[PDB]
């Protein structure tokens, strides 16, 4: 019912993530202010699953500096049996989030749109690709998006719609999460990703890496919002737009 780490004592008020070894806890301090602890049990834990782990926490603690789009990393207690990480705690997750609305305001679209440009450039410029960007590893804190994790232990959850073609055609590049950025931003446009209707799986990556396979692209007042969809969602990594192309963009810019 509660956590201790380095001395302080939090309270429970629920668990909100879980995969593998791993928990996350919406929790309160003595002052009743709001964090994110992760505990992660290492007693029975693969050296693969260890590093990925250790990995994680030095990164995490690297960008905190870099920027405020990158989820606060407050303190840690790491020991060979267990792991507490205390975090930021955001309003919501963009999934949740994006179930709930009947509709985006679109200057809203565009504020999180440069959100998780800033992010994820910010990870790329030390030389990580996420991989794996979903609208769950973005959370609303202050009408602001910041990311929640960097691709590098990847147990944790609350689709395969949000793969790029070359991860599925390599039997990677930053361009890979520009992919994924471009199936986020398309949902938040259309209220769709591009793939979603496609039924079964085995059909859904057949159509991600087809040529042959258009995506479509209706009509929409802001002409340049389109065109970043277009671009983001060129199956050639190597014809996609980059993340300093984007922050240079009308839609950003103009
Ligand atoms: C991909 O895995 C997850 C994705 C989204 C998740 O949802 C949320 C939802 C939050 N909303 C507050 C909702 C509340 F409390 F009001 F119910 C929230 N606040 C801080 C963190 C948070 C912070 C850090 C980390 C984390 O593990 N980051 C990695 C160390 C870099 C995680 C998974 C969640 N989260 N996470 C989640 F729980 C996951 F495990």
Redesign the pocket.
């Known amino acids: 019912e509660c956590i201790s780490v380095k001395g302080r004592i939090y309270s429970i008020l ?1 668990q ?4 593998g070894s ?1 928990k ?1 806890f ?1 929790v309160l301090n003595e002052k009743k202010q ?1 964090y ?1 602890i ?1 505990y992660v049990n290492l007693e029975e834990a693969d050296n693969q699953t260890l590093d990925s782990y250790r990995n ?2 030095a990164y ?1 603690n690297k960008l905190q500096q870099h920027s405020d789009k990158i ?1 606060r ?1 407050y303190d840690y207690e790491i020991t060979d049996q267990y792991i507490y ?1 205390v ?7 963009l ?1 949740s989030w994006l179930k709930k609305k009947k509709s985006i305001d679109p200057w809203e679209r565009k504020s999180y749109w440069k959100n998780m440009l800033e992010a994820v450039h910010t990870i790329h410029q030390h030389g990580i690709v996420h991989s794996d960007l ?1 609208p ?2 973005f ?1 609303i804190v202050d009408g602001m998006l910041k990311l ?3 691709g590098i ?1 990847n147990q ?3 689709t395969v719609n949000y793969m790029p073609p070359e991860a599925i055609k390599d039997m990677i590049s930053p361009k890979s999460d520009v992919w994924s950025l471009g199936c986020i931003l398309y949902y938040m446009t259309y209220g769709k990703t591009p793939f979603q209707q496609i039924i079964n799986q085995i059909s859904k990556l057949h159509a991600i890496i087809d040529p042959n396979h258009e995506i479509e692209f209706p009509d929409i007042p802001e002409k340049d919002l389109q065109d970043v969809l277009k671009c983001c969602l060129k199956r050639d990594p190597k014809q996609r737009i980059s993340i300093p192309e984007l922050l240079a963009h009308p839609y950003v810019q103009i």
Do not use: R, T
């Open positions: 629920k909100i993530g879980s995969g791993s996350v919406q709001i994110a992760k994680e926490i995490l989820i990393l990480m975090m930021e705690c955001g309003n919501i997750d999934n979903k769950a590893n959370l929640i994790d960097f232990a944790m959850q609350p």
